[PDB]
Amino acid sequence: QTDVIVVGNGVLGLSVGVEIARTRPDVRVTLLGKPARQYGATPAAGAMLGAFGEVTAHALASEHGRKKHALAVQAQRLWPEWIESLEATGTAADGRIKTADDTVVLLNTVGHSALDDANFAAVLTALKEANAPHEEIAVESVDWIDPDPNSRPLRALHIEGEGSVDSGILLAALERSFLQAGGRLHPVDATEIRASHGRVEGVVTDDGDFLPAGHVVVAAGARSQRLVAALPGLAHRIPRIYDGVGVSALVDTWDGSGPATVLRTSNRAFACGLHLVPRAGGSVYIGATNAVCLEPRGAASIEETVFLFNCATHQLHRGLNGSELRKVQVGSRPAPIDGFPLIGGTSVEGLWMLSGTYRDGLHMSPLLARHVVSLMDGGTGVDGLREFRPERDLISAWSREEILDDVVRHTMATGYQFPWRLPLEWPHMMETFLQGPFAELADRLSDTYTPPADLMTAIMFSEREQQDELIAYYADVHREWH
Amino acid sequence: VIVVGNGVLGLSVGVEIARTRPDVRVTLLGKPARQYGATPAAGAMLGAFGEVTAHALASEHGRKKHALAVQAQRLWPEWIESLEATGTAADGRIKTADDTVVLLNTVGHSALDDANFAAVLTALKEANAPHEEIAVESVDWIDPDPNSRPLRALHIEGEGSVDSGILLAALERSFLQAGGRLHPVDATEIRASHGRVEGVVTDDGDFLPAGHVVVAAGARSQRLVAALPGLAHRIPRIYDGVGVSALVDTWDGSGPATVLRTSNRAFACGLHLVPRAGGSVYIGATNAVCLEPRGAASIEETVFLFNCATHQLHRGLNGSELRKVQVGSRPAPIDGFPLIGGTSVEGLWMLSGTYRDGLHMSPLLARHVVSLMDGGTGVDGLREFRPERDLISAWSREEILDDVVRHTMATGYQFPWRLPLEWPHMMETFLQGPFAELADRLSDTYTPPADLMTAIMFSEREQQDELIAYYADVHREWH
Amino acid sequence: QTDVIVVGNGVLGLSVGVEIARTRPDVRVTLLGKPARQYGATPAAGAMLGAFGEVTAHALASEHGRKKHALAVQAQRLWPEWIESLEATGTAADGRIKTADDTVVLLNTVGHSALDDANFAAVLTALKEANAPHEEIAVESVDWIDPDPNSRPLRALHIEGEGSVDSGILLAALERSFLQAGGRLHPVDATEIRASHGRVEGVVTDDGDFLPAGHVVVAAGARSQRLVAALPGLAHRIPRIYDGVGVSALVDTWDGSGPATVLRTSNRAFACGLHLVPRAGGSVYIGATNAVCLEPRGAASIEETVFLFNCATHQLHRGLNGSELRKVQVGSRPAPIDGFPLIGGTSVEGLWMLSGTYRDGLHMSPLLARHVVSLMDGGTGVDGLREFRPERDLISAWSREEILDDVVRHTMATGYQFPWRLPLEWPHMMETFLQGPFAELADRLSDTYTPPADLMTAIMFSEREQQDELIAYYADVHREWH
Amino acid sequence: QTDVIVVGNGVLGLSVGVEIARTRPDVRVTLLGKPARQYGATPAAGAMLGAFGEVTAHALASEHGRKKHALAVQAQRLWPEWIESLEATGTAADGRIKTADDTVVLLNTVGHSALDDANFAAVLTALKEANAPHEEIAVESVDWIDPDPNSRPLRALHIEGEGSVDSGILLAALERSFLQAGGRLHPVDATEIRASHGRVEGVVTDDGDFLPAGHVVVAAGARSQRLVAALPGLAHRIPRIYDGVGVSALVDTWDGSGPATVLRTSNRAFACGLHLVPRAGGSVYIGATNAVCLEPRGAASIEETVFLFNCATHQLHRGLNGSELRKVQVGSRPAPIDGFPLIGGTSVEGLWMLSGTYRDGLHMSPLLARHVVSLMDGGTGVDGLREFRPERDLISAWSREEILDDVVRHTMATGYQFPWRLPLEWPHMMETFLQGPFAELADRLSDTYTPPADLMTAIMFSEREQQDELIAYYADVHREWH
Ligand SMILES: Cc1cc2nc3c(=O)[nH]c(=O)nc-3n(C[C@H](O)[C@H](O)[C@H](O)COP(=O)(O)OP(=O)(O)OC[C@H]3O[C@@H](n4cnc5c(N)ncnc54)[C@H](O)[C@@H]3O)c2cc1C
Ligand SMILES: Cc1cc2nc3c(=O)[nH]c(=O)nc-3n(C[C@H](O)[C@H](O)[C@H](O)COP(=O)(O)OP(=O)(O)OC[C@H]3O[C@@H](n4cnc5c(N)ncnc54)[C@H](O)[C@@H]3O)c2cc1C
């Protein structure tokens, strides 16, 4: 069997499917997944082609973070030809994948100085270091925005050639391009990967059928590790992936207008953020919340909807207040337990993984697809992706001290982003009383592993049973790798 | 008989006709989509005493409307029994709560909330209704923000709620069981000649003949009848009272045993939670009178509804899952009172303009119109709400101008805003002039109620001018 | 002539001075203290004749609290004849001591339900138990008030015969009555009490002079214990008194109007509260903040002034916003470390103490004065003031558990009273993270003594050196008494 | 009589007194005014030597505004030698007049974009046009400040050589320098200026005395025009001066620290502003509110104190919250009805006026003093000050349209500066409903004169009788000059 099965119909599954089908016209490539795309991240995405917009001081302070950033900058160079190659299989009436060429990053005071001020400085530095075209511009020169004056930006950064795509039109163009290249869509879900004598045999589907294959590529988003972890030994050799549950919305604007550019803040408390992505036809996309959940969730909370709407109406455009809500969207960012993606080969011959991309899998998709296809054809793919091999000991990209500083800063940032109004002694009081319980949790979980802040807050407020299960997991991983 | 409309009023009258006249063919029009439908967006509360305001009970027309709501409450137990009788256990229960708790908090204007709470208490005592002012600590389930918490609570016995979705299903089933036929199309035009109804042209191009046409098309009811000769200025206009509500799956699957509500608030919105089966709660409900229909919630409406419920009722709703944002059009009559009964056109009847409490009044209104169709006199106090009439003037222009400014200020206090203390008095004084000027400009005789006056104040000049023309044409017709 | 020296020129010193001079024509009575009245509580007081208004659920849950309450109810009965006897020594132009006969207690939502709702219920219960004349009234029937609707009361309680005095006119009338009865005012401060062979010899003054006496009555407010603690053994036998620093203000109202009654809330976080006391001549008194300080402070903080003004303008009358500020007043409530007053005799012959009355020494003054004068004349004074003898082991009126529940409730109440606006998950988060540090502090301070909540918060946020000094103090007290 | 009487003991009276006494050792110069300095602006001032810091877009849009700005830049050059000459008459223990050399202007979002953003741009432009030393600096590089993150600055401007003086030390140094130069201080107030045959005879004082003089210089702050208006015809020939009532405070900082520079915002709603001026000895000055009052007021309102304290603690330093309030200061900025100063000679021989300097008389004092002394000695003084001659038709520096735009913008700015939290439709609603009543008022007051925004808001909210009296005044001025 030289047959290829791609498990997953998100941006990563379809992107790798398209690259395999185009590159190996000799082989049969079958892509699994249903049109409902349950918990799907890609359909809930705007989406921003975020390289520089995703820069944080905390990310760029670690070697693993600087490597992830380098890959995002590399991926940006592939997008123009990738889009051309996908629109080539379609006509004008299919709609345009690209919705904006440029991004404006806004700095307002509706957040923590320790995140927003540091992150704005880090973005400016990363742009200069990469020789990317950009300009700090007068806020008065930013098109379209009409913020509440008390929520308004005082600094603005124009990033040239950092744009957005319509995630729905991208998925349609990938499916069309996949079929054009001879790929076959089988609208069922994989239940189980079959392997024996350290080699893949194929996939059992949820209609009871068995599909044989020499290659299985797992791109099932937040379900990817749970699917592979069933194979012998792999439960403690493939890092867990959780659901980074994200809420976004489509709004029909009061006057049918929209901005010419992406409008965004830097990443904010626990990897949420505020952005507006232009859409065709009098629609705008607003996003996006983030909460790491130990179990999947397919519905927005009241809190998430209110926070998203309140931020957009005050910080971007008060006209959105009177605008019509068309759709609340919910998707699961694949959130890796060690904070880095799972991309490449396994100890099982013919078994590949493309997952754990959290906030920027869609942006990195053309690079990640080409990397995995290179590896499948006996190549070395892309240089900096080696460290993010899916079969690995949990990465420790930061000291426990750095993470404990970060988790307290991010907790305080949930206050400043609201924005709260409190007596002035309360924030210092909460800072001092948060340090102890988070230090105690970190020490209790493991002697070697520390979860990143986004996951640590989820664990802090989870049931005792869920905490104990994670202590067991971390201990089993240490046993396996040490 | 053709019933035009598949809301609570159309189906309720359809069921009563089909059961009462087994000799006649009754056909009910309307689509399963129920576009702009009020009934599916309703909780719904069987609100009689809960709907009492000081402003309503200060007018004779308001006191008449209240009397009818108290009468309607007595019909509900046997009405529900008669609708559930046509179904089985698996169809679910129409009744979702027996009792209501009215909460008084300070997240609103004293001039509405304090006056309205006193008016509810008075109306209960006057009607000898079973009720008790209770300790807030004794209210089950609620977990408000302390700064948004109630300091007074009122338990109303036998004032409850129904599942509006299960009610609609039970009405459709009961209608079919009684020999009614559902034709899922919309009426485009009522046909009449020699002052008598001939039937209805439908939107699939067909013509259905009838000796009787009952218009219960919610907010579309007057626009449908106004096409017939003279009736444009003889049937009071009905606008869309666009309302937003939501279904929430609670964090722990719990819900309150009773309806939880405030009194009616700025421009006939209000905060309430209606129990549902299966770990769901209904939260409602916004209200904005729109001169044109709107089928989607605004961001502002969604945020206001969620913010009020999480702070004033239960902070646990914050972490609860949003299942559905619902939008419907309360039929908002331009003179503030319903359109119920016969026309100058033989066989033409209207059941509409019920705004906030058509669903509660439905069994009474259905029986009234069926009595009239059988040559009876129906219910005594419904005469004044005959659909073919001069616009009612239930309040002085002065009362309405006081009310519209109070309600405008109440939008601030309900937010709740935080302002420099001189700003509210400054806004009160600068609001009075423009609203007095608008009222004087619109007509020398008619004043729109506050809910509609705010919509007109912030409408286009062309829409204002069209209303000046309408009011002038009505005065010409009746004076 | 067998000389008596009263050390202190507040309400308690002058009240006891007047009672001695009137009752004992045989004794020469000299009263020390300067007209500046440094750190003086009495001049900063409104003052309310608070018996029922001062009731809290927490106070009435302890035996010591119920005893203190009984004495406040007894003191109320003495005020009419006491005022008559003080005004008798003056003329019309001296002004009236009594400023109001009745009090209205208001319940609004600008505070914690766990204090304000419980305390309102406790006031209502105490009134019914005492058969005191009172009526729950419609808020619309409360005269004069014009609150912000979002800060308005929804319940109101009229207390008949619970009134107020002008503290300044009371002090003037006491000084005049003291002179009329043959008392002498010596405007210097005591530096040292002289004692040998377990008997008082007299007082060294701060002008270097020595005044001989057979009797010394210490009524020096918050300085009372520090003055007596210099005598042998008494450092660990007289409970420490700290400064309950309070800020109040005199305001000339926009229209010269004022309310006919006292307007107040129940006691709020850390024994502060909101009240308005009527004054003559188009003036109103607004009060009053409270912060226990381990060292004296004679100036208002910005925070205290803003909190007091914000509460009064929103919760009582918006007209106060445009009213003229005449005076910011600061005084030290004598705050006893064990939460109960220091009234009566010492192990030193002729040495008496009248202090540690915290919030209601002025109200209790005629009763306390008569008690101590009775004791000095060989009488038994008033029943049930025995328990508040100044030379004692620290009282433990509450379990450590009760105090730890109270300190967390009061801490949260500082938020609700502001009032803050926070994300809805934050208060529960702060409640859970406050419990641990306060339990840890309580355990560290002593194995037997627990400071009441008002003092525990001050110790929690004091320097490590001040905490260690208090650990030493508590240990030295245990050694002395066990 | 060659005797000179200076009426007023503020910065302008004493500055002109010193210059006359030093320049004319042959003449007797007597300076009137009491040490209480009732309604005195100078003692309530920080004070900033504000030239560029005082720049607004609205001021620099008028020719009269640009002229006033040029004079402020000229005045700055005189300060170093002026201070040297005043300190020369004293000793080390008298303390230093200068308290800072530099100013940092901060831009935060606690205000209207239409004032704060425009004014920050106008300051930057005025600095570049004048070639003045300045630098836009990183906010993180601003020393000492510790703002609430939600109230923090995002832009900062360092202005070199724009500093501050201690107003109290300046007044002491001026009085001492006046005596050293042979001036005599007579601590009484002028009641009446005596003139006949178009020449000054002298001054009747409030102790009933008459002082003869050939020269009377009126520098009585906000009382200056009311004093001269009693002389024949001058009621409608000298523009009215009102009280710009200002509230400031002296604070002892928590740790005795203070900033090395002035910290300020640009001028805000109705010519108030937020600033901190360094002082010696662990004190800081915070200011300053402004409200034009048609009658004098000597006491702060609650509202003014709360606004000043809230702005300083949130926007400058949260440490000020726990800092001790030493003094609330109130003074009357002389607010000319036509918005420009009254400097120079009259139609009455020997009668001079130095007044109506509003926010920057103290800064301009050395220039203004030298101008008037030059004129008295038959010189032409300083070129651009001719236009601000005290005997004039009311200046119309702006169109009625410009003022109506300004008054509505400033009214809305009172909301954004609070800062308020409102439903997003409310500000647009208030903007539209404010325009009509202010247009109606402006049209009713006069067909030719429009009061500037600061005065127009005061007139809008004054009694009908006060409005009618102003209609009469404006009509009488038109009659006199047309
Ligand atoms: C948010 C919200 C909350 C509410 N809460 C309550 C509550 O608590 N208690 C209460 O008593 N009531 C409540 N109501 C509803 C209120 O009682 C209304 O007055 C009542 O539902 C109106 O019923 P109706 O049948 O007249 O109109 P609808 O329910 O609107 O029904 C009219 C129907 O006619 C159809 N139609 C329109 N045009 C045509 C045509 N040409 N031909 C055929 N069909 C047509 C529409 O699609 C619709 O389905 C609420 C309403 C809303 C929107
Ligand atoms: C803001 C505020 C509000 C209050 N409101 C009320 C109220 O509503 N009702 C009420 O009943 N009470 C009220 N009180 C007061 C409370 O009852 C006090 O407990 C009471 O005033 C204590 O009186 P005192 O005479 O013991 O102390 P103080 O009034 O402090 O008098 C002590 C005096 O002794 C002087 N002194 C200090 N050291 C020496 C020395 N060595 N030699 C000589 N003299 C010395 C001090 O300068 C001072 O003048 C309030 C107090 C404050 C601060």
PDB file of N, CA and C in Angstrom, chain A residues 43-86:
ATOM      1  N   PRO A  43     -12.780  27.090  10.892  1.00  0.00           N
ATOM      2  CA  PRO A  43     -13.982  27.842  10.522  1.00  0.00           C
ATOM      3  C   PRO A  43     -14.291  29.011  11.467  1.00  0.00           C
ATOM      4  N   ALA A  44     -13.808  28.959  12.709  1.00  0.00           N
ATOM      5  CA  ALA A  44     -14.018  30.004  13.746  1.00  0.00           C
ATOM      6  C   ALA A  44     -12.940  31.094  13.634  1.00  0.00           C
ATOM      7  N   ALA A  45     -11.978  30.931  12.728  1.00  0.00           N
ATOM      8  CA  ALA A  45     -10.823  31.850  12.566  1.00  0.00           C
ATOM      9  C   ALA A  45     -11.192  32.948  11.564  1.00  0.00           C
ATOM     10  N   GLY A  46     -10.543  34.103  11.697  1.00  0.00           N
ATOM     11  CA  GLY A  46     -10.843  35.326  10.930  1.00  0.00           C
ATOM     12  C   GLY A  46     -10.549  35.187   9.442  1.00  0.00           C
ATOM     13  N   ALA A  47      -9.274  34.999   9.073  1.00  0.00           N
ATOM     14  CA  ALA A  47      -8.157  34.749   9.966  1.00  0.00           C
ATOM     15  C   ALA A  47      -7.000  35.671   9.586  1.00  0.00           C
ATOM     16  N   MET A  48      -6.227  36.087  10.583  1.00  0.00           N
ATOM     17  CA  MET A  48      -5.018  36.914  10.381  1.00  0.00           C
ATOM     18  C   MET A  48      -3.850  36.020   9.959  1.00  0.00           C
ATOM     19  N   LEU A  49      -3.061  36.469   8.986  1.00  0.00           N
ATOM     20  CA  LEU A  49      -1.759  35.818   8.642  1.00  0.00           C
ATOM     21  C   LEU A  49      -0.711  36.433   9.569  1.00  0.00           C
ATOM     22  N   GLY A  50      -0.827  36.088  10.856  1.00  0.00           N
ATOM     23  CA  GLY A  50      -0.126  36.744  11.972  1.00  0.00           C
ATOM     24  C   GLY A  50       1.238  36.124  12.172  1.00  0.00           C
ATOM     25  N   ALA A  51       2.264  36.910  11.875  1.00  0.00           N
ATOM     26  CA  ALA A  51       3.687  36.627  12.154  1.00  0.00           C
ATOM     27  C   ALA A  51       4.155  37.634  13.202  1.00  0.00           C
ATOM     28  N   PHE A  52       4.227  38.903  12.824  1.00  0.00           N
ATOM     29  CA  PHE A  52       4.694  40.015  13.690  1.00  0.00           C
ATOM     30  C   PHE A  52       3.607  40.395  14.694  1.00  0.00           C
ATOM     31  N   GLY A  53       2.336  40.350  14.283  1.00  0.00           N
ATOM     32  CA  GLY A  53       1.189  40.642  15.162  1.00  0.00           C
ATOM     33  C   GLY A  53       1.121  39.704  16.358  1.00  0.00           C
ATOM     34  N   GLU A  54       1.624  38.476  16.215  1.00  0.00           N
ATOM     35  CA  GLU A  54       1.619  37.433  17.273  1.00  0.00           C
ATOM     36  C   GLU A  54       2.822  37.565  18.222  1.00  0.00           C
ATOM     37  N   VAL A  55       3.737  38.499  17.984  1.00  0.00           N
ATOM     38  CA  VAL A  55       4.973  38.626  18.799  1.00  0.00           C
ATOM     39  C   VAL A  55       4.601  39.103  20.209  1.00  0.00           C
ATOM     40  N   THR A  56       5.123  38.414  21.227  1.00  0.00           N
ATOM     41  CA  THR A  56       5.105  38.854  22.638  1.00  0.00           C
ATOM     42  C   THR A  56       6.538  38.878  23.181  1.00  0.00           C
ATOM     43  N   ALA A  57       6.807  39.744  24.162  1.00  0.00           N
ATOM     44  CA  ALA A  57       8.096  39.798  24.886  1.00  0.00           C
ATOM     45  C   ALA A  57       8.388  38.414  25.473  1.00  0.00           C
ATOM     46  N   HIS A  58       7.397  37.765  26.093  1.00  0.00           N
ATOM     47  CA  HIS A  58       7.551  36.442  26.752  1.00  0.00           C
ATOM     48  C   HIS A  58       7.981  35.364  25.747  1.00  0.00           C
ATOM     49  N   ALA A  59       7.351  35.306  24.567  1.00  0.00           N
ATOM     50  CA  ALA A  59       7.681  34.323  23.506  1.00  0.00           C
ATOM     51  C   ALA A  59       9.138  34.519  23.064  1.00  0.00           C
ATOM     52  N   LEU A  60       9.518  35.750  22.721  1.00  0.00           N
ATOM     53  CA  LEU A  60      10.848  36.107  22.161  1.00  0.00           C
ATOM     54  C   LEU A  60      11.954  36.068  23.235  1.00  0.00           C
ATOM     55  N   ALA A  61      11.614  35.835  24.502  1.00  0.00           N
ATOM     56  CA  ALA A  61      12.580  35.684  25.613  1.00  0.00           C
ATOM     57  C   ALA A  61      13.071  34.231  25.701  1.00  0.00           C
ATOM     58  N   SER A  62      12.406  33.277  25.036  1.00  0.00           N
ATOM     59  CA  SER A  62      12.806  31.844  25.031  1.00  0.00           C
ATOM     60  C   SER A  62      13.360  31.464  23.655  1.00  0.00           C
ATOM     61  N   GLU A  63      14.278  30.496  23.612  1.00  0.00           N
ATOM     62  CA  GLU A  63      14.862  29.990  22.346  1.00  0.00           C
ATOM     63  C   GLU A  63      13.747  29.345  21.504  1.00  0.00           C
ATOM     64  N   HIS A  64      12.900  28.514  22.110  1.00  0.00           N
ATOM     65  CA  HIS A  64      11.770  27.820  21.419  1.00  0.00           C
ATOM     66  C   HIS A  64      10.810  28.859  20.833  1.00  0.00           C
ATOM     67  N   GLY A  65      10.491  29.910  21.591  1.00  0.00           N
ATOM     68  CA  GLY A  65       9.670  31.042  21.114  1.00  0.00           C
ATOM     69  C   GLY A  65      10.281  31.742  19.909  1.00  0.00           C
ATOM     70  N   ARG A  66      11.594  32.001  19.912  1.00  0.00           N
ATOM     71  CA  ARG A  66      12.299  32.671  18.781  1.00  0.00           C
ATOM     72  C   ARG A  66      12.277  31.752  17.554  1.00  0.00           C
ATOM     73  N   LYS A  67      12.366  30.439  17.747  1.00  0.00           N
ATOM     74  CA  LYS A  67      12.310  29.433  16.646  1.00  0.00           C
ATOM     75  C   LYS A  67      10.913  29.453  16.007  1.00  0.00           C
ATOM     76  N   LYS A  68       9.862  29.429  16.831  1.00  0.00           N
ATOM     77  CA  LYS A  68       8.438  29.466  16.399  1.00  0.00           C
ATOM     78  C   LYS A  68       8.221  30.758  15.601  1.00  0.00           C
ATOM     79  N   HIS A  69       8.757  31.883  16.073  1.00  0.00           N
ATOM     80  CA  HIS A  69       8.622  33.193  15.389  1.00  0.00           C
ATOM     81  C   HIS A  69       9.301  33.150  14.011  1.00  0.00           C
ATOM     82  N   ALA A  70      10.521  32.618  13.919  1.00  0.00           N
ATOM     83  CA  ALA A  70      11.287  32.487  12.650  1.00  0.00           C
ATOM     84  C   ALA A  70      10.429  31.747  11.622  1.00  0.00           C
ATOM     85  N   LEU A  71       9.793  30.649  12.020  1.00  0.00           N
ATOM     86  CA  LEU A  71       8.916  29.826  11.145  1.00  0.00           C
ATOM     87  C   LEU A  71       7.701  30.633  10.668  1.00  0.00           C
ATOM     88  N   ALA A  72       7.090  31.446  11.531  1.00  0.00           N
ATOM     89  CA  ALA A  72       5.962  32.325  11.156  1.00  0.00           C
ATOM     90  C   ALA A  72       6.416  33.332  10.098  1.00  0.00           C
ATOM     91  N   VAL A  73       7.619  33.885  10.232  1.00  0.00           N
ATOM     92  CA  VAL A  73       8.151  34.874   9.244  1.00  0.00           C
ATOM     93  C   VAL A  73       8.379  34.151   7.912  1.00  0.00           C
ATOM     94  N   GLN A  74       8.892  32.924   7.946  1.00  0.00           N
ATOM     95  CA  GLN A  74       9.140  32.094   6.734  1.00  0.00           C
ATOM     96  C   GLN A  74       7.811  31.793   6.053  1.00  0.00           C
ATOM     97  N   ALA A  75       6.794  31.383   6.811  1.00  0.00           N
ATOM     98  CA  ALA A  75       5.453  31.032   6.285  1.00  0.00           C
ATOM     99  C   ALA A  75       4.856  32.220   5.530  1.00  0.00           C
ATOM    100  N   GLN A  76       5.039  33.446   6.000  1.00  0.00           N
ATOM    101  CA  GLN A  76       4.458  34.674   5.378  1.00  0.00           C
ATOM    102  C   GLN A  76       4.899  34.769   3.920  1.00  0.00           C
ATOM    103  N   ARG A  77       6.129  34.374   3.599  1.00  0.00           N
ATOM    104  CA  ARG A  77       6.722  34.490   2.237  1.00  0.00           C
ATOM    105  C   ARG A  77       6.013  33.532   1.276  1.00  0.00           C
ATOM    106  N   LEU A  78       5.452  32.425   1.774  1.00  0.00           N
ATOM    107  CA  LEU A  78       4.779  31.395   0.935  1.00  0.00           C
ATOM    108  C   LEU A  78       3.358  31.827   0.562  1.00  0.00           C
ATOM    109  N   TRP A  79       2.731  32.763   1.277  1.00  0.00           N
ATOM    110  CA  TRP A  79       1.262  32.991   1.188  1.00  0.00           C
ATOM    111  C   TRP A  79       0.863  33.514  -0.185  1.00  0.00           C
ATOM    112  N   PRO A  80       1.558  34.514  -0.775  1.00  0.00           N
ATOM    113  CA  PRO A  80       1.149  35.056  -2.070  1.00  0.00           C
ATOM    114  C   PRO A  80       1.036  33.991  -3.182  1.00  0.00           C
ATOM    115  N   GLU A  81       2.034  33.113  -3.326  1.00  0.00           N
ATOM    116  CA  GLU A  81       2.056  32.056  -4.376  1.00  0.00           C
ATOM    117  C   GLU A  81       1.070  30.932  -4.008  1.00  0.00           C
ATOM    118  N   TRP A  82       0.943  30.603  -2.719  1.00  0.00           N
ATOM    119  CA  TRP A  82      -0.012  29.591  -2.193  1.00  0.00           C
ATOM    120  C   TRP A  82      -1.440  29.999  -2.566  1.00  0.00           C
ATOM    121  N   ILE A  83      -1.822  31.245  -2.282  1.00  0.00           N
ATOM    122  CA  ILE A  83      -3.164  31.800  -2.619  1.00  0.00           C
ATOM    123  C   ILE A  83      -3.373  31.743  -4.133  1.00  0.00           C
ATOM    124  N   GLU A  84      -2.404  32.221  -4.919  1.00  0.00           N
ATOM    125  CA  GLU A  84      -2.452  32.200  -6.412  1.00  0.00           C
ATOM    126  C   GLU A  84      -2.743  30.769  -6.881  1.00  0.00           C
ATOM    127  N   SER A  85      -2.054  29.769  -6.329  1.00  0.00           N
ATOM    128  CA  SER A  85      -2.158  28.339  -6.716  1.00  0.00           C
ATOM    129  C   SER A  85      -3.527  27.766  -6.320  1.00  0.00           C
ATOM    130  N   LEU A  86      -4.187  28.314  -5.295  1.00  0.00           N
ATOM    131  CA  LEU A  86      -5.510  27.825  -4.825  1.00  0.00           C
ATOM    132  C   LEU A  86      -6.621  28.530  -5.608  1.00  0.00           C
TER     133      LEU A  86
END
